[PDB]
């Protein structure tokens, strides 16, 4: 319409962040309980929802990209949504607002660019995802032949229904393996199977799903024991250690290959821009600065002290002592201890801010802001030299004395000042800062997107046990973070996919189609991981390694 | 005269035999009975070890005799504590330094050693930083969760003047089943008392192994010596996020990445380009170690039918669709099915291995079945059938053979352009380094006969990480829990298990009275050392292995490639029907016709272009139809390649016997 396109495209933008935050504060209640905050949230998704309408009614002029696709499919699905939810798993379909937060990528060009890359990054790995597609399928059926329905005979009492142990493990199938021997107990079928049914080879679907947790190094020790008990003790070992080899140090070997053979790719070709001279020519004036600086100085405007050799060894010696100060707490330490301690800290803080203070009055007060080396220093001794008086004052803060230590042991970083390595690439590193902060916050945003996703699939179902109470749940938003983090490091994620997948029946019914939601978060979650962190160290550590080699020819 | 004995030490038999010994006499020491003292196996190994230790005696006294390295000093010192030892259990750890011998003996395994030495001397710097952040981390949890970690036995008394006596369990959440329990007020396993248990805390941290255990349990602490709150804390989790992100995420993949760039940079010394840069030295060198194959064709037409008919696009994809069916039947077999559905699967079964065997028979009427089992392929789906069609009368040991019909579908893998060639290039690397392994195969041996030496008299029980099928009693099960460690299954819930107030299995010849003896403190330096040695050493061969075959990681397929190269020979013998050197130059107009652009000549008109390129640069003046393979081949390179004038064609072979290697006599007519 009329001209609208500086204001309006960031008002959207923080339209879309407000839509993020309100959906962040929403608790997922169990068995369509809920408070007051779902009661106003629900006529704040309202109001989004009609502005939303408003500003893409708007914009019609559109379809064809498909960023501005799923900006009006969000837009439909929900006023469907919405008219489902008044005329009555309806409020399942609430789930595609999941995908707003997806929306503020199209805002910023600069992070648009990032994504694509990634995502562009993407097509040399589908030989190895297929590779492992077939090593899946032939595994799952090497196992459906193999083994079929035997892990499905524990021990009971004599003649009951009670299992013996608390913790069950299948008899032999054929008088081979495992024998329960105790008191009175007798093994018969009609067991539900280890982890309630849901690992086991007794089914195509199981076969793949078991054969996908074993190659992700999780949980495969657990399959090959209970194979063990159940079957036999000669052919399930040389099953999974095969399948932990060839599934998964060989692939990722393949993974890791093919990502560094396209890194240097992009890196040859950069190079070729002179993108590498960019950073040369601004690190070799940085050497011309300093000794432009003080020696142009020096003439007219302690000096030998502080240049000595002796009060560099001194200096470390003081850190030293205040590292050995700092590492000897324990608990329950010596009444003795704590009061050499808390005078220790006051003398050497008095001693540093003496020689700041000499260092500051020697060379130079403009010269030294400049600087990021000393430029916290001054900050940490102002904070040690106020946690004194602060403490001594009429201000107790018992939690304030644990979180003061902290600035003051960052001190030890004063003894890796000269490396030439450390500080090299600590200059490319932040050099690159802006595209660490782009990624990083592109897979804060994949994370957020993620756990949104699991509040609103799993949030208020994991109270079904009766006996016991879960930790690691999607109730609310921090949990689910902390659930989607643990997750994405690949630490008993299997055990989230069981919770999850009993949470909507069983290994029996469709509820086992749920488990695509922990395939894919695994699957695609460690690939962006894959391509953020190990990207930011290849391709800031050829930079750092190309300056030694113009550094030290130059020299 | 000290020159037989120089001539017996040096001869050719005599060192074979001193390294198959010293292999030998380690596999002899990866047998012994680790609980049974008093057991008939070690009376025989220990004879054993006498004779092996008389050689190795014998051998260092000869070389001594011709004498007169810091190798030789470690020979002295293994064969030294064996005779010492004919306390003794310090002597016995040492016993383990016998695959070590064997270092300076193979070229390889020394090379790979020092390599992997000057891999960690240039990677020192990293470490440094990473453990300076280890322990400030642990410093600042040592600061925060100082004694908040423990907790009763049960969760009601929340002090230590309360978690005294008795009181009463209800198993399993029932109100009616209920037991009578102790109350001990215990810390926690992992906690962060002091520096050290903080370090190793934060080690098991990022290890990613167990750390939502520990997240969760100091998320609950409430104070210095009370106990826990549900969720008291959820915000200290960002320690425990921020921690992981920086040393695990960060510090953990820019150690990768600097071991990748450093043997990038290692292996570019090839500093060669005065007229060659990478691409010439990978593209002309296939020129010159390629060998002309033939097509096999038969004769007797009345034979050649079959041939004709087995030969073609329809019957490859008719077989692709018939083996994706087998495979589908295969695989949808589920538990307690129908006994219906059990025999319509036999008859489909019946059906499949029929059709494959006609499919056999077919293909060995019309491929001449002298050179049918030549290839790999052919030969192994004929194991496939045979196996397979026993098996039909047997119906009504046998699960042996089932697997075989499961392994045509790997034949489906080498049908595509890419997948199949990204394994061969992996496959060949791993072949080409096969020492690198061999360092991972002693760290495991090494370590496993510790485990036994130490850990082996530990008890097996159900409810702990020793159990019946995890325990260091016999060398493939220590092996499996090192490889399980290695993986990093449960690693600290054993190295846990394995501490000194452990039950002893009632087997070992311990001192009556007392049976909580077995277990040592050397459990946690073992499992760490085990765990970042292993790391490092599986990183090493991945790296080595990724840089062994680094062009086709970065080949650039628009440019050129050996499969250009590939394609044109292929093509090229459909005109050619024997490798017998010189072709006929006929049909050489239609062949750059089929030849795709970047090697051959566009969809244009090949008589404006083509034909002009193909006798205006200069060939071999040999007769009409007589012209070598190579002539054809290196002088197409040559073509696509650094294109010069007229009369500087003698830098060509200037080039190739300077830059290039020996050329061996077989540029004479390529002179030309
Ligand atoms: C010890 C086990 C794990 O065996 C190994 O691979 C070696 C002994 N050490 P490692 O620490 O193993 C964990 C990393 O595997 C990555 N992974 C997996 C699948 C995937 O699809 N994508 C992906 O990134 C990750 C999930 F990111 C983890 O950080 O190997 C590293 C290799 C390169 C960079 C960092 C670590
Ligand atoms: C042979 C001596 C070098 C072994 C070694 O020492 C170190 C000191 C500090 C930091 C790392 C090392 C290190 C490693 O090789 C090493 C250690 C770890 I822990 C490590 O990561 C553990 C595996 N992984 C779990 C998924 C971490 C993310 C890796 I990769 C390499
Ligand atoms: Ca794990």
Redesign the interface.
């Given at each position: 319409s009329i001209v609208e396109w500086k204001p309006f495209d960031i008002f959207i933008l923080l339209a879309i962040f407000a839509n993020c935050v309100a959906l962040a504060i929403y608790i997922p209640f169990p068995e369509d309980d809920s408070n007051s905050t779902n009661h106003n949230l629900e006529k704040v998704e309202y109001a989004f929802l009609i502005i939303f309408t408003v500003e893409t009614f708007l914009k019609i002029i559109y379809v064809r990209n498909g960023w501005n696709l799923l900006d009006f499919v969000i837009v439909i699905v929900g006023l469907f949504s919405v008219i489902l939810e008044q005329l009555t798993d309806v409020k399942a379909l609430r789930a595609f607002r999941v995908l707003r937060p997806l929306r503020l990528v199209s805002g910023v060009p600069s992070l648009q660019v990032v994504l694509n890359s990634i995502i562009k990054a993407m097509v040399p790995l589908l030989?190895?995802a297929?590779?492992v597609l077939?090593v899946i399928?032939?595994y799952?059926?090497?196992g459906?032949?193999?083994f079929?329905?035997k892990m499905h005979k524990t021990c009971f009492f004599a003649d009951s229904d009670i299992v013996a142990?608390?913790?069950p493990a299948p008899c032999a199938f054929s008088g081979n393996g495992?024998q329960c021997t105790a008191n009175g107990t007798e093994c018969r079928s009609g067991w539900v199977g280890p982890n309630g049914g849901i690992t086991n080879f007794?089914?195509?679907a199981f076969a793949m799903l078991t054969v996908f947790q074993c190659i992700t190094?999780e949980?495969?020790?657990d399959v090959?024991?209970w194979m063990?008990?159940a079957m036999g003790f000669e052919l399930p070992?040389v099953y999974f250690?095969s399948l932990?080899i060839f599934g998964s140090?060989?692939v990722?070997?393949?993974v890791?290959?093919?990502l560094?053979?396209e890194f240097?790719?992009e890196r040859?070709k950069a190079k070729a821009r002179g993108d590498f001279q960019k950073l040369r020519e601004k690190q070799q004036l940085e050497e011309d600065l300093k000794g432009y600086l003080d020696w142009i100085t020096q003439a007219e405007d302690c000096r030998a002290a502080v240049k000595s050799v002796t009060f560099y060894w001194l200096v470390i010696v003081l850190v030293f002592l205040n590292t050995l100060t700092?590492?000897?707490?324990?608990?329950?330490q010596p009444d003795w201890l704590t009061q050499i301690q808390d005078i220790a800290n006051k003398v050497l803080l008095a001693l540093f801010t003496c020689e700041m203070l000499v260092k500051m009055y020697s060379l130079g007060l403009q010269a030294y802001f400049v600087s990021l080396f000393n430029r916290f220093d001054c900050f940490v001794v102002c904070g040690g030299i106020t946690e004194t008086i602060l403490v001594e004052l009429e201000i107790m803060s018992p939690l304030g004395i644990?979180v003061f230590?902290?600035v003051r042991?960052?001190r030890?970083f004063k003894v890796?000042r000269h490396?030439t390595?450390?500080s090299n690439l600590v200059a490319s590193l932040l050099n690159s800062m802006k595209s660490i902060a782009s990624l990083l916050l592109l897979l804060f945003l994949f994370i957020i997107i993620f756990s949104l996703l699991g509040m609103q699939l799993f949030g208020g179902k994991f109270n079904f046990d009766?006996?016991?109470?879960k930790?690691?749940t999607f109730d609310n938003f921090?949990?689910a973070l902390?659930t989607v983090?643990?997750i994405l490091?690949?630490?008993?994620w299997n055990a989230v996919m069981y919770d999850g997948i009993m949470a909507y029946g069983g290994p029996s019914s469709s509820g086992m189609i749920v488990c695509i939601y922990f395939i894919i978060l695994f699957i695609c979650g460690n690939y962006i991981?894959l391509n953020v962190?190990?990207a930011?160290?290849?391709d800031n550590?050829?930079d750092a390694?190309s300056l030694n080699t113009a550094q030290k020819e130059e020299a | 005269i000290r020159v037989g004995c120089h001539k017996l030490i040096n001869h050719h038999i005599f060192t074979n035999l001193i390294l198959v010994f010293i292999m030998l006499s380690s596999a002899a020491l990866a047998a012994e009975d680790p609980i049974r003292s008093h057991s008939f196996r070690n009376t025989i190994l220990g004879y054993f070890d006498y004779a092996f230790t008389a050689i190795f005696t014998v051998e260092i006294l000869l070389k001594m005799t011709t004498f007169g390295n810091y190798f030789n000093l470690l020979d002295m010192l293994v064969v030294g504590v064996s005779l010492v030892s004919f306390v003794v259990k310090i002597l016995r750890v040492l016993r383990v330094l016998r695959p070590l011998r064997a270092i300076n003996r193979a070229k390889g395994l020394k090379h790979v050693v020092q390599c992997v030495f000057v891999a960690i001397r240039t990677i020192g710097?990293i470490m440094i930083?990473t453990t300076?952040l280890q322990?400030?981390f642990?410093?600042?949890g040592?600061?925060?969760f100082?004694?908040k970690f423990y907790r009763c036995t049960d969760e009601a008394k929340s002090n230590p003047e309360e978690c005294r006596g008795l009181f009463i369990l209800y198993?399993?959440?029932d109100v009616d089943s209920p037991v009578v329990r102790e109350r001990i007020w215990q810390n926690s396993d992992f906690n962060f008392?002091?520096?050290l248990s903080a370090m190793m805390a934060l080690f098991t941290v990022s290890t990613?192994?167990?750390?939502?255990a520990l997240?969760?349990k100091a998320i609950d602490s409430n104070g210095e010596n009370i106990g826990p709150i549900?969720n008291h804390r959820?915000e200290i989790?960002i320690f425990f996020?921020i921690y992981?992100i920086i040393v695990?995420?960060?510090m953990m993949?820019?150690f990768?990445?600097?071991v990748?760039?450093?043997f990038?940079?290692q292996g570019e010394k090839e500093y060669k380009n005065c007229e060659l840069d990478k691409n010439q030295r990978q593209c002309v060198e296939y020129a010159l170690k390629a060998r002309p194959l033939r097509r096999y064709i038969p004769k007797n037409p009345y034979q050649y039918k079959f041939w004709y008919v087995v030969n073609s696009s329809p019957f490859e994809y008719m077989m692709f669709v018939l083996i994706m069916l087998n495979?589908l039947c295969?695989?949808?077999?589920?538990?307690?099915q129908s006994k219906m559905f059990n025999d319509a699967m036999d008859i489909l079964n019946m059906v499949f291995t029929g059709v494959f065997t006609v499919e056999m028979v077919l293909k060995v009427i019309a491929f001449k079945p002298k050179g049918y089992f030549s290839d790999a392929w052919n030969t192994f789906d004929s194991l496939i059938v045979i196996g397979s069609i026993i098996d039909v009368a047997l119906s009504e040991s046998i699960?042996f053979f089932?697997?075989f019909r499961?392994m045509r579908?790997?034949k489906?893998?080498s049908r595509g352009e890419?997948?199949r060639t990204?394994?061969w290039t992996?496959i060949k690397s791993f072949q080409a380094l096969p020492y690198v392994a061999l360092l991972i195969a002693m760290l495991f041996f090494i370590y496993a006969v510790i485990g036994m030496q130490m850990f082996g008299k530990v008890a097996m029980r159900?409810?702990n990480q020793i159990?019946?099928?995890?325990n260091f009693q016999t060398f493939?099960q220590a092996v499996?829990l090192l490889?399980?460690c290695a993986?990093?299954?449960?690693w600290q819930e054993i190295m846990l298990a394995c501490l000194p107030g452990k039950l002893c299995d009632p087997e070992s010849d311990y001192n009556p009275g007392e049976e909580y003896t077995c277990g040592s403190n050397f459990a946690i330096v073992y499992f760490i050392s085990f765990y970042m040695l292993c790391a490092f050493l599986?990183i090493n061969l991945?790296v080595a292995?990724?840089m062994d075959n680094?062009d086709?990681?970065?080949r650039?397929w628009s440019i050129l490639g050996p499969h250009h190269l590939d394609e044109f020979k292929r093509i090229w013998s459909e005109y050619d029907p024997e490798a017998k050197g010189r072709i006929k130059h006929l049909d050489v107009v239609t062949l750059l016709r089929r030849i795709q652009p970047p090697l051959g000549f566009g969809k244009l008109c090949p008589h404006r272009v083509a034909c002009k390129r193909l006798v205006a640069m200069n060939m071999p003046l040999n007769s009409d139809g007589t012209v070598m393979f190579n002539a054809t081949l290196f002088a197409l390179v040559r073509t696509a390649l650094k294109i010069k004038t007229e009369g500087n064609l003698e830098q060509a072979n200037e080039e190739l016997r300077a830059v290039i290697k020996k050329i061996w006599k077989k540029t004479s007519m390529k002179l030309l």
């Open positions: 030989h190895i297929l590779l077939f399928i032939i799952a059926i090497i459906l032949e193999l079929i329905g142990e608390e913790d495992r007794d089914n195509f190094m949980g495969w020790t090959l024991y063990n008990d070992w250690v932990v140090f060989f990722l070997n393949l890791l290959g093919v560094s053979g240097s790719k040859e700092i590492s000897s707490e324990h608990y329950n644990s230590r902290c042991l960052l030890i890796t490396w390595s450390l009766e006996t016991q109470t930790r690691s921090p949990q902390l983090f643990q490091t690949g630490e008993d991981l962190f190990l930011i160290a290849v550590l050829a390694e | 710097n930083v300076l322990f400030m642990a410093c600042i040592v600061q925060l100082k004694g198993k399993d959440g008392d002091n520096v990613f192994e167990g750390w939502p997240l969760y549900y959820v989790s996020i992981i695990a995420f960060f993949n820019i990768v990445g600097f990748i760039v450093t990038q940079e495979t295969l695989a949808m077999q589920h538990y307690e699960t089932r697997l499961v579908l790997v489906l893998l890419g997948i990204l394994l992996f159900d409810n159990n019946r099928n995890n493939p499996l490889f399980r993986t990093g299954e449960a599986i991945f292995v990724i680094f086709y990681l970065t650039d």
